[PDB]
Amino acid sequence: TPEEKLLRAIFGEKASDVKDSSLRVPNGVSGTVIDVQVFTRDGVEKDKRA
Amino acid sequence: REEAVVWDILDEVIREHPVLLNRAPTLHRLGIQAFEPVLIEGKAIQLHPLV
Amino acid sequence: QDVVLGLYYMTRDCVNAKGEGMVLTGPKEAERLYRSGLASLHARVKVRIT
Amino acid sequence: KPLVGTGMERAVAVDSGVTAVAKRGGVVQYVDASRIVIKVNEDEMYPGEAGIDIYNLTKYTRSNQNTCINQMPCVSLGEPVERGDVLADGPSTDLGELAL
Amino acid sequence: EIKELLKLGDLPTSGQIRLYDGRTGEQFERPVTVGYMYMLKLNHLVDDKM
Amino acid sequence: TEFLKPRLVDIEQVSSTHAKVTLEPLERGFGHTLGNALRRILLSSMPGCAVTEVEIDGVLHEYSTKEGVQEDILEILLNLKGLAVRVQGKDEVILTLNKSGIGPVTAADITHDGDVEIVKPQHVICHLTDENASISMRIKVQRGRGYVPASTRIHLVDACYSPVERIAYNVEAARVEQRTDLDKLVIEMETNGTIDPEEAIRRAATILAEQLEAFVD
Amino acid sequence: EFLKPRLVDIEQVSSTHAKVTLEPLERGFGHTLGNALRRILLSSMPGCAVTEVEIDGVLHEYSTKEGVQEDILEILLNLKGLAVRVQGKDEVILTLNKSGIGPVTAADITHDGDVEIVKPQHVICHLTDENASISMRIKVQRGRGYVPASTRIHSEEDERPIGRLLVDACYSPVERIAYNVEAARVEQRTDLDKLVIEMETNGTIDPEEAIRRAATILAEQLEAFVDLEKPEFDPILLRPVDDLELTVRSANCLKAEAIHYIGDLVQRTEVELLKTPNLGKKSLTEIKDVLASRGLSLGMRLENWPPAS
């Protein structure tokens, strides 16, 4: 919006075509990661870590 | 962020500001009673014995 | 429940107990007698009260 | 372990599969916090394939949300084991008994 | 049998002993029962309920 | 691994002879150890003098009646415990009650000696009935480091020495910043007026420090 | 007018515990002290408990090391109970190495000037295979009270060594303290009492030291007893320069040039920077971009940096 447009203008941030959906740890709960699994649809290229 | 300063602020907004406490089968009107909050470490509600 | 067990145990009297029979000016010094181990919580005693 | 008890606790630990019970008797060849290998005695051994019974212990893993189910070997290197003895306690089992 | 097993123990039959408040260090009138009870943690744990 | 000593100490003292003091923050557990011990000394061991014995001018015994006084002798003994005696360097003094008449003998009706100081002349000792109502006698005091009962004068007045009429210590939770739970210690005490509460404490725990002078470093 | 007490024979019985005694005790003071000392004895005393343990191939405490029958969690748990003592150091890292089939005790570590292993037989864990080897960095520090691993992470600040498994702090010499006042008849006095304080310990502290420091804190607390809205600059300016997430090369130059906070940086000028060692056009280009991204630039003059407390 107008005032939002000015806000990016002063502080010079490029507002992304992408929004953050990232999975983050629930509030207050804290622990150690003992494992990670990666499932992929058949045909999408598996990324590096996976 | 839970900056250290807010806890003191919470003590201000809490002071005179009752909260309603209620238990499961509300029967007579005493099933809901108002109390003045006292900040307590821990996840449990502490409840005056006489009540 | 606990509180009523306390007060009952508080005011109850046995037949013979430490401090039986003595006399005190007032409750202040009654507690002073008790806390010190001189007088039993329950013993028949005359004390001045107002 | 229960300090005061009844005597079913042995049966409960074993019958539930939480603990790991020896299939055949013999002597322990190898004990690791990971696996347990038992060298079978001949009376219990079948003629073909010879064999040793290898028990792969379960390690830290997910329960039907959210507990952890983890086994610890209760036996030591080179120990006599008889058929039907607890090789390892599961969660809430101590030496073959039921400890809740 | 319990009393007999308590006899081998060196511990009294009443199953009660003298106990002292860790605060004042004073004794407790009457013996209190002390012993070993098996106790469970049910899983209601509070940082679920809150 | 340095230690914790407290900060801010409100003393709200009712009247003069009565006081309730709060001291916070402490380290967890310390309010109770400091509190209790300070209570033990204050109660069971304190320097002070009140009454071990008084001769009876009326009779030779503790079981008897007087002429002109409705108070029983035990009543007067009661009153005796309540007389405030602060004696100077003089270790044991003795006074006289000389007075008579139609009205109660107060503490201003007692002779005034040199080293004797009574904090309340107003104190009511016993009444005085009609007419002449013969009364006066000699009173001997005594010192104690504690409270001395009646049966303890084994070779009679229960001797209440310790200026403390009452001592209680309330331990409540103290909040310091990122320190979760602490002890906030509130000492409430009444005195017989000889020494004010505030200093009785000071000395009360000064006794404590001196017993320890053999350990520190 | 009063009598002060003092100690007397302190009788050691086992390497663990001992019975100290305190004669010169007046009427009732046996209780006034004995509980007050138990109080300070059980809790606040100095102690050294193992804290951070970084082991070989172990990623987290929930895994299993091939070749050892103890779950890592259990080995961590065994360490919390390793009793040690240092002298002039407040934290030391001990290197434990051993291999081969057999028990690995606590005496197998590598000795240090302040290292005293009070229980050389204390079992760290077993070893189940001919060639199986465990190397470990064991960080022991000294402190007071109970500090569980949980409260240990607030400060953080690059605890990144994913290999470092924290354990819970056991700090305390005292195990069990009990006091009994039996009447001590010194040859002449009416009635005086004694104090038999029978204590119990992990072997890392001597009786006299304890009982002394106990009373030490006590009177030390009586000490007190005896007598009776305008922010100016932008808050972001006081954030450390590390918050800019510069290149390794660029970050070191600023610390090397005495530029530690954002406020210091916004003052320095373009001209000055190419003259500082290691910085060329390439390095400076990175810096100009990150500053514009937070609404800043170089060389702004502030007539009052910084204020004022």
Curated annotation (Swiss-Prot), chain A:
It comes from the Bacteria. Co-administration of salinamide and rifampicin or salinamide and myxopyronin suppresses the emergence of resistance to both antibiotics. Acetylated on several lysine residues in the presence of glucose. The RNAP catalytic core consists of 2 alpha, 1 beta, 1 beta' and 1 omega subunit. When a sigma factor is associated with the core the holoenzyme is formed, which can initiate transcription. The rRNA transcription and antitermination complex (rrnTAC) consists of RNAP, NusA, NusB, NusE (rpsJ), NusG, SubB, ribosomal protein S4, DNA and precursor rRNA; S4 is more flexible than other subunits. In pull-down experiments interacts with CedA. Belongs to the RNA polymerase beta chain family. DNA-dependent RNA polymerase (RNAP) catalyzes the transcription of DNA into RNA using the four ribonucleoside triphosphates as substrates. This is DNA-directed RNA polymerase subunit beta. It comes from Escherichia coli (strain K12). The chain holds residues 896 to 945 of 1342 of the full protein.
Curated annotation (Swiss-Prot), chain B:
Co-administration of salinamide and rifampicin or salinamide and myxopyronin suppresses the emergence of resistance to both antibiotics. Acetylated on several lysine residues in the presence of glucose. The RNAP catalytic core consists of 2 alpha, 1 beta, 1 beta' and 1 omega subunit. When a sigma factor is associated with the core the holoenzyme is formed, which can initiate transcription. The rRNA transcription and antitermination complex (rrnTAC) consists of RNAP, NusA, NusB, NusE (rpsJ), NusG, SubB, ribosomal protein S4, DNA and precursor rRNA; S4 is more flexible than other subunits. DNA-dependent RNA polymerase (RNAP) catalyzes the transcription of DNA into RNA using the four ribonucleoside triphosphates as substrates. Resistance to the antibiotics salinamide A, salinamide B, rifampicin, streptolydigin, CBR703, myxopyronin, and lipiarmycin can result from mutations in this protein. Belongs to the RNA polymerase beta' chain family. This is DNA-directed RNA polymerase subunit beta'. It comes from Escherichia coli (strain K12). The chain holds residues 403 to 453 of 1407 of the full protein.
Curated annotation (Swiss-Prot), chain C:
Transmembrane segments: none annotated. Co-administration of salinamide and rifampicin or salinamide and myxopyronin suppresses the emergence of resistance to both antibiotics. Changing residue 1 to P: Resistant to antibiotics salinamide A and B. Acetylated on several lysine residues in the presence of glucose. DNA-dependent RNA polymerase (RNAP) catalyzes the transcription of DNA into RNA using the four ribonucleoside triphosphates as substrates. Belongs to the RNA polymerase beta' chain family. The RNAP catalytic core consists of 2 alpha, 1 beta, 1 beta' and 1 omega subunit. When a sigma factor is associated with the core the holoenzyme is formed, which can initiate transcription. The rRNA transcription and antitermination complex (rrnTAC) consists of RNAP, NusA, NusB, NusE (rpsJ), NusG, SubB, ribosomal protein S4, DNA and precursor rRNA; S4 is more flexible than other subunits. This is DNA-directed RNA polymerase subunit beta'. It comes from Escherichia coli (strain K12). The gene is rpoC.
UniProtKB/Swiss-Prot annotation, chain G:
Gene3D superfamilies: 5' to 3' exonuclease, C-terminal subdomain, DNA-directed RNA polymerase, insert domain, RNA polymerase, RBP11-like subunit. The modification N6-acetyllysine is found at residues 281-282. One of its GO terms (biological process) is response to heat. It is an enzyme of class 2 (transferase). The modification ADP-ribosylarginine is found at residue 249. Residues 1-228 are annotated as: Alpha N-terminal domain (alpha-NTD). Keywords: Acetylation, ADP-ribosylation, DNA-directed RNA polymerase, Nucleotidyltransferase, Transcription, Transferase. InterPro entries: DNA-dir_RNA_pol_insert, DNA-dir_RNA_pol_RpoA/D/Rpb3, DNA-dir_RpoA, RBP11-like, RNAP_asu_C, RNApol_insert_sf. CDD domains: RNAP_alpha_NTD. DNA-dependent RNA polymerase (RNAP) catalyzes the transcription of DNA into RNA using the four ribonucleoside triphosphates as substrates. This subunit plays an important role in subunit assembly since its dimerization is the first step in the sequential assembly of subunits to form the holoenzyme. Part of the processive rRNA transcription and antitermination complex (rrnTAC). The complex forms an RNA-chaperone ring around the RNA exit tunnel of RNAP. It supports rapid transcription and antitermination of rRNA operons, cotranscriptional rRNA folding, and annealing of distal rRNA regions to allow correct ribosome biogenesis. This is DNA-directed RNA polymerase subunit alpha. It comes from Escherichia coli (strain K12). The lineage of its organism: Bacteria, Pseudomonadati, Pseudomonadota, Gammaproteobacteria, Enterobacterales.
